[PDB]
Design an enzyme around this catalytic site. Structure first.
Site, short mmCIF file in Angstrom:
data_model
loop_
_atom_site.label_atom_id
_atom_site.label_comp_id
_atom_site.label_asym_id
_atom_site.label_seq_id
_atom_site.Cartn_x
_atom_site.Cartn_y
_atom_site.Cartn_z
N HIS D 202 14.83 3.26 -0.30
CA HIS D 202 14.63 4.69 -0.13
C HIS D 202 15.28 5.57 -1.20
CE1 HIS D 202 13.55 4.28 4.43
NE2 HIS D 202 12.63 3.79 3.62
N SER D 206 8.74 4.00 -2.71
CA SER D 206 7.87 2.92 -3.14
C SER D 206 7.30 3.06 -4.54
CB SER D 206 6.70 2.76 -2.18
OG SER D 206 7.14 2.38 -0.90
N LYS D 228 -2.44 2.29 8.55
CA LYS D 228 -2.77 1.22 7.61
C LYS D 228 -1.97 -0.04 7.98
CE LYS D 228 -3.09 0.41 2.55
NZ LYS D 228 -4.56 0.15 2.50
N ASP D 229 -0.68 0.13 8.27
CA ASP D 229 0.14 -1.01 8.63
C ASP D 229 -0.23 -1.65 9.98
OD1 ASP D 229 3.36 -0.14 7.08
OD2 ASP D 229 1.38 -0.62 6.24
N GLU D 272 8.35 -28.82 6.06
CA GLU D 272 7.29 -27.95 6.47
C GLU D 272 6.70 -27.42 5.16
OE1 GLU D 272 5.87 -26.76 9.36
OE2 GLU D 272 6.90 -28.52 10.20
C1 HEM Z 1 13.09 -10.57 5.78
C2 HEM Z 1 12.54 -10.16 4.45
C3 HEM Z 1 12.19 -8.89 4.01
C4 HEM Z 1 11.95 -7.73 4.73
C5 HEM Z 1 11.99 -7.46 6.26
C6 HEM Z 1 11.46 -6.81 3.71
C7 HEM Z 1 10.99 -5.54 4.01
C8 HEM Z 1 10.55 -4.62 3.06
C9 HEM Z 1 9.89 -3.38 3.41
C10 HEM Z 1 9.69 -2.83 4.82
C11 HEM Z 1 9.50 -2.80 2.23
C12 HEM Z 1 8.62 -1.57 2.12
C13 HEM Z 1 7.10 -1.86 2.24
C14 HEM Z 1 6.55 -2.76 1.12
O1 HEM Z 1 6.50 -2.32 -0.05
O2 HEM Z 1 6.19 -3.91 1.40
C15 HEM Z 1 10.01 -3.68 1.19
C16 HEM Z 1 9.88 -3.45 -0.14
C17 HEM Z 1 10.37 -4.25 -1.16
N1 HEM Z 1 10.97 -5.46 -0.91
FE1 HEM Z 1 11.25 -6.41 0.77
N2 HEM Z 1 11.52 -7.33 2.41
C18 HEM Z 1 11.90 -8.61 2.60
C19 HEM Z 1 12.11 -9.52 1.57
C20 HEM Z 1 12.05 -9.23 0.25
C21 HEM Z 1 12.13 -10.21 -0.81
C22 HEM Z 1 12.35 -11.70 -0.66
C23 HEM Z 1 12.03 -9.52 -1.98
C24 HEM Z 1 12.09 -9.98 -3.30
C25 HEM Z 1 12.63 -11.30 -3.73
C26 HEM Z 1 11.81 -8.16 -1.57
C27 HEM Z 1 11.59 -7.17 -2.45
C28 HEM Z 1 11.24 -5.90 -2.16
C29 HEM Z 1 11.05 -4.90 -3.19
C30 HEM Z 1 11.35 -5.11 -4.69
C31 HEM Z 1 10.42 -3.86 -2.61
C32 HEM Z 1 9.74 -2.75 -3.42
C33 HEM Z 1 8.25 -2.58 -3.17
C34 HEM Z 1 7.56 -1.62 -4.15
O3 HEM Z 1 7.32 -2.02 -5.32
O4 HEM Z 1 7.26 -0.46 -3.77
N3 HEM Z 1 11.78 -7.99 -0.22
N4 HEM Z 1 10.59 -4.84 1.69
C1 LIG Z 2 16.48 -30.05 8.62
O1 LIG Z 2 15.40 -30.32 7.73
N1 LIG Z 2 14.45 -29.35 7.87
C2 LIG Z 2 13.34 -29.41 7.14
C3 LIG Z 2 12.27 -28.33 7.29
O2 LIG Z 2 11.14 -28.52 6.84
O3 LIG Z 2 12.58 -27.18 7.95
C4 LIG Z 2 11.46 -26.28 7.98
C5 LIG Z 2 13.12 -30.47 6.28
C6 LIG Z 2 12.28 -31.52 6.67
C7 LIG Z 2 12.06 -32.59 5.81
C8 LIG Z 2 12.66 -32.61 4.56
C9 LIG Z 2 13.50 -31.57 4.17
C10 LIG Z 2 13.73 -30.50 5.03
C11 LIG Z 2 14.75 -29.48 4.52
O4 LIG Z 2 14.37 -28.38 3.69
N2 LIG Z 2 14.11 -28.69 2.40
C12 LIG Z 2 14.38 -28.04 1.27
C13 LIG Z 2 13.84 -28.86 0.10
C14 LIG Z 2 15.02 -26.84 0.99
C15 LIG Z 2 14.80 -26.22 -0.24
C16 LIG Z 2 15.47 -25.05 -0.57
C17 LIG Z 2 16.37 -24.50 0.34
C18 LIG Z 2 16.60 -25.11 1.57
C19 LIG Z 2 17.57 -24.48 2.57
F1 LIG Z 2 18.52 -25.35 2.91
F2 LIG Z 2 16.89 -24.13 3.66
F3 LIG Z 2 18.15 -23.40 2.07
C20 LIG Z 2 15.92 -26.28 1.89
#
Ligand code: HEM
Ligand SMILES: CO/N=C(/C(=O)OC)c1ccccc1CO/N=C(/C)c1cccc(C(F)(F)F)c1
Ligand SMILES: CCCCCCCC/C=C\CCCCCCCC(=O)OC[C@H](COP(=O)(O)OCCN)OC(=O)CCCCCCC/C=C\CCCCCCCC
Ligand SMILES: CCCCCCCC/C=C\CCCCCCCC(=O)OC[C@H](COP(=O)(O)OCCN)OC(=O)CCCCCCC/C=C\CCCCCCCC
Ligand code: HEM
Lengths: 101, 80, 61, 380, 109
Positions: D202, D206, D228-229, D272
């Site tokens: 915020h 966005s 939209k969402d 998985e």
């Molecule tokens: C439990 C995971 C997450 C939640 C609940 C979450 C939620 C949100 C929400 C509600 C927005 C605003 C709507 C949208 O643009 O989609 C947002 C934006 C964003 N999120 Fe996340 N997010 C998550 C994970 C991540 C991850 C893994 C990344 C990047 C590695 C990330 C990067 C961003 C960024 C950079 C924005 C900016 C969007 C734009 O360009 O306007 N988020 N996120």
């Molecule tokens: C407890 O293991 N849970 C497994 C799974 O599938 O959960 C959905 C699983 C199953 C078979 C082989 C490896 C994994 C373990 O996960 N494997 C990898 C390779 C991994 C890779 C990056 C990070 C992490 C962690 F630690 F969650 F952060 C885990």
């Protein structure tokens, strides 16, 4: 020969912002230098840029583009900001260099 | 307060109609679809290629892996 | 014109709109379930216990 | 105080400045729908999670059957179990599209929103990892074993860290009970961090698909995006439910319908789907230590993205070379996912290293390079 | 916000006190419109051209006095409640926004 020119004109068309009626400089990411340059633009150039951009955002939300006739042509693209921006950067580098000495 | 401090804007006029005066999904055939096609067309050659390559590599590797499980008669031709 | 009648009677006043949703839901549920179940059973004639039940339901030993 | 109570009130004001009067770009696409889905996804996992937790027993001698008792005796326990297990996948599909969108549109330039994001991903993975162990089936146990044994490869502090994590000499009851506690806990950290995520977000508002300032054209979040969402929610929710209701076990390993047995190693220990890409990279480096670092790097690499942006433009909308590189990378990921599900043999081994190598190359060398190259082609 | 708010009050919760006062203000206004020859002449020319006759203050007052809370609410609801309005905005209007949001201000007091 005219190879660099063939490539540029090619990339220019591949990029496609001209389909939104935008100038190359309209598409610049607004970091600090670019933000300063924009503040220096004369009023008319600034409002024209603003309309162009607003217009592009509206096309973007609509999922449309301008009719082919209205596309900016490679050779008619006005690099309106590049001049200001280069100056802004020149000044910055001067200060940076000077503050080290 | 984020509405009113955003941008200096001048000389732009906009016209809009209430949602009740207009149609929700207008000109599907005259405008919508053509554009859908337009959008697909402009992207297919950027997206498709690598996915196609992925598929090939996938097919090769899957078939090559099975081929290596089969037997080569050339290892038993003189086992009498 | 139902659309106008609907609008005037049901959708205009926010209070009647909610009433229409609630009463609308109650009737939708009753109907929708009956139909779904009906469709499901027809698509599965003689496979459900409901269908074979009579064979052992007071007709054995 | 102020005219309407939506702005004055210390709480509604918060609800209003983030879900009603919140200025949103007028042109953000469906790709921006994943944030809200992630949030809803999170609330759902937590909800179904609690419902399952109320019938679970964290003990090696009762875990498997407690889950079975839930599915067989609890009213709709079978449904809740399905929704929870499959919801984990909906969560990752959503998180990967969320990230993708970010890479393609330069959302990462919002550094803090990005870094908290990377943290959300890591926490989500840990959550699913510990969660997976709870049913105590064969893949539960062996996956736990395979992964945790990787740390005994860390120098000097290795063996310690591992036996500390297990609470003994192998994955056993003490491990299970602490994993339950962690699984119950982490989701709440995710909710917490999610708030920080949106808070940083915020500060800027966005980004949008054209990558240029949208101050000239902003619209209130409500009704535009709330609608939209909600639409986006039902559109995704349909395939989710279709899968969970018509093909419940499509994504799971049958090996997990067998109680864990430390005296029988399953033939193909694989995770998985959402972990496969990483498992592939893990196995690409034959050398316990190197592979572990490679695995770690495969996700930590996300913290470097903000520093590898060379383009003069924010998004990739107007950068065709970057666009193909982008889809090359996507395909690269499907390949790693595929390699991750295959046994470690020719030709999967060589293919695997190719994919692992190209993965890091594309993000570390090619993207920044092509960006610079493109800057020249625009005469910049 | 407040303005549209007041319109909704008109349709849903007008008070006899308000109309009572509103009427007196209206009476004074109509009288004040016949303050001089030019203004009386303007009235005659207009009334004829629009009503096809003259409406005396004595009549206007009769009509004005028949209005009550209940009537104001019905009439206003009839022309304002849940209607799509016409909007014109000129100047530094960035903070006013979205027809949709305004359209929603057209219902529920
Ligand atoms: C439990 C995971 C997450 C939640 C609940 C979450 C939620 C949100 C929400 C509600 C927005 C605003 C709507 C949208 O643009 O989609 C947002 C934006 C964003 N999120 Fe996340 N997010 C998550 C994970 C991540 C991850 C893994 C990344 C990047 C590695 C990330 C990067 C961003 C960024 C950079 C924005 C900016 C969007 C734009 O360009 O306007 N988020 N996120
Ligand atoms: C407890 O293991 N849970 C497994 C799974 O599938 O959960 C959905 C699983 C199953 C078979 C082989 C490896 C994994 C373990 O996960 N494997 C990898 C390779 C991994 C890779 C990056 C990070 C992490 C962690 F630690 F969650 F952060 C885990
Ligand atoms: C048997 C069942 C009977 C009992 C059930 C009780 C439920 C009744 C609910 C009360 C009725 C609602 C009243 C709404 C009135 C407010 C309103 O304005 O309408 C909503 C308003 C519409 O605005 P206007 O079109 O401008 O209307 C103007 C009217 N002159 O906002 C909306 O769009 C809401 C309606 C869409 C709902 C979207 C939900 C999508 C979710 C789907 C997933 C499924 C649900 C799962 C729930 C999870 C629970 C753990
Ligand atoms: C990561 C874990 C790996 C798991 C597998 C990855 C997921 C595989 C599913 C495939 C994704 C389906 C998407 C297909 C949609 C095709 C499409 O519409 O592309 C064209 C379209 C054109 O957009 P513009 O240039 O703005 O055009 C504007 C003018 N009209 O491009 C887009 O929509 C933008 C792409 C964003 C979505 C990316 C989704 C893929 C997700 C993968 C994550 C990858 C990133 C890095 C993660 C490392 C960990
Ligand atoms: C961030 C959200 C969560 C994720 C991603 C998640 C993920 C998982 C996964 C992958 C499993 C294994 C499912 C299976 O195949 O059987 C699982 C099981 C379980 N989770 Fe969660 N979970 C989350 C939150 C929660 C929460 C908040 C609780 C409750 C406090 C919870 C309680 C459980 C329980 C009791 C099980 C065991 C029963 C079962 O295996 O179905 N989960 N979770």
């Amino acid at each position: 020969g005219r190879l660099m020119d063939r490539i540029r004109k090619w990339y220019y068309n591949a990029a496609g912002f001209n389909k939104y009626g935008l100038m190359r400089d309209d598409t610049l990411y607004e970091d600090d230098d670019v933000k300063e340059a924009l503040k220096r633009l004369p009023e008319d150039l600034y409002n024209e840029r603003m309309f162009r951009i607003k217009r592009a955002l509206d096309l973007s939300l609509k999922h449309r583009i301008l009719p082919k006739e209205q596309w900016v042509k490679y050779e008619e693209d006005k690099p309106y900001l590049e001049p200001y921006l280069k100056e802004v950067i020149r000044e910055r580098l001067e200060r940076e260099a000077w503050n080290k000495k | 307060i984020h509405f009113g401090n955003l941008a200096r804007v001048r000389h732009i006029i906009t016209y809009s109609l209430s949602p009740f005066e207009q149609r929700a999904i207008p000109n599907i055939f005259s405008d919508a679809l053509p554009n859908v096609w337009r959008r697909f067309s402009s992207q297919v050659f950027k997206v498709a290629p690598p996915f196609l390559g992925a598929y090939l590599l996938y097919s090769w590797g899957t078939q090559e892996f099975e081929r290596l499980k089969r037997k080569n008669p050339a290892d038993y031709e003189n086992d009498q | 014109a139902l659309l106008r009648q609907a609008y005037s009677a049901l959708f205009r006043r926010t209070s009647t709109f909610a009433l229409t949703v609630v009463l609308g839901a109650v009737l939708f549920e009753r109907a929708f379930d009956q139909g779904a179940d009906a469709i499901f059973e027809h698509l599965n004639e003689g496979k459900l216990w409901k269908h074979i039940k009579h064979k052992y339901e007071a007709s054995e030993e | 105080m102020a005219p309407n109570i939506r702005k004055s009130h210390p709480l509604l004001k918060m609800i209003n400045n983030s879900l009603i009067d919140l200025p949103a770009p007028s042109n953000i696409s469906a790709w921006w729908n994943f944030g809200s889905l992630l949030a809803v996804c999170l609330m759902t996992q937590i909800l179904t999670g609690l419902l399952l937790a109320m019938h679970y027993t964290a003990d090696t001698s009762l875990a498997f059957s407690s889950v079975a008792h839930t599915c067989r005796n609890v009213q709709y326990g079978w449904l809740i179990r399905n929704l929870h297990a499959n919801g984990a996948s909906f969560f990752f599909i959503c998180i990967f599209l969320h990230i993708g969108r970010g890479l393609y549109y330069g959302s990462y330039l919002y550094k803090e929103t990005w870094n908290t994001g990377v943290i959300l991903l890591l926490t989500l993975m840990a959550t699913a990892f510990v969660g997976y162990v709870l049913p105590w089936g064969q893949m539960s146990f062996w996956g736990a074993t395979v992964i945790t044994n990787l740390f005994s490869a860390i120098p000097y502090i290795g063996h310690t860290l591992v036996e500390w994590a297990w609470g003994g000499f192998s994955v056993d009851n003490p491990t299970l009970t602490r994993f339950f506690a962690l699984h119950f806990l982490l989701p709440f950290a995710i909710a917490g961090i999610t708030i920080i995520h949106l808070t940083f977000l915020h500060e800027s508002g966005s980004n949008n698909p054209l990558g240029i300032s949208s101050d000239s054209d902003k619209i209130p979040f409500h009704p535009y995006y709330s609608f939209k969402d909600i639409l986006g929610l039902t559109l995704m929710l349909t395939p989710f439910l279709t899968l969970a209701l018509f093909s419940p076990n499509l994504l799971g390993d049958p090996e997990n319908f067998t109680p864990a047995n430390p005296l029988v190693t399953p033939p193909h220990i694989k995770p998985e789907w959402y972990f496969l890409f990483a498992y592939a990279i893990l196995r690409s480096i034959p050398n316990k230590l190197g592979g572990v670092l490679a695995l770690a790097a495969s996700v930590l690499i996300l913290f470097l993205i903000p520093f590898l942006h060379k383009s003069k433009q924010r998004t990739m909308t107007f950068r065709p070379l970057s666009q193909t590189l982008f889809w090359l990378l996507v395909a690269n990921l499907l390949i790693l996912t595929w390699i991750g599900s295959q046994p470690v043999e020719h030709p999967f081994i060589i293919i695997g290293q190719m994919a692992s190598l190209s993965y890091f190359t594309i993000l570390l060398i090619l993207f920044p390079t092509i960006g610079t190259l493109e800057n020249k082609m625009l005469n910049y | 916000f407040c303005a549209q708010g007041e319109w909704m009050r008109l349709c849903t919760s007008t008070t006899e006190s308000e109309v009572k006062r509103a009427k007196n203000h209206l009476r004074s206004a109509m009288v004040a419109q016949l303050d001089g020859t030019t203004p009386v002449c303007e009235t005659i020319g207009s009334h004829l051209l629009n009503y096809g006759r003259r409406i005396s203050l004595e009549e206007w007052d009769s009509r004005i006095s028949a209005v009550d809370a209940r009537m104001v609410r019905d009439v206003c609801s009839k022309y304002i409640y849940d209607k799509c309005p016409a909007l014109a905005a000129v100047g530094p209007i960035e903070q006013l926004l979205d027809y949709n949001r305004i359209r929603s201000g057209m219902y529920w007091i």
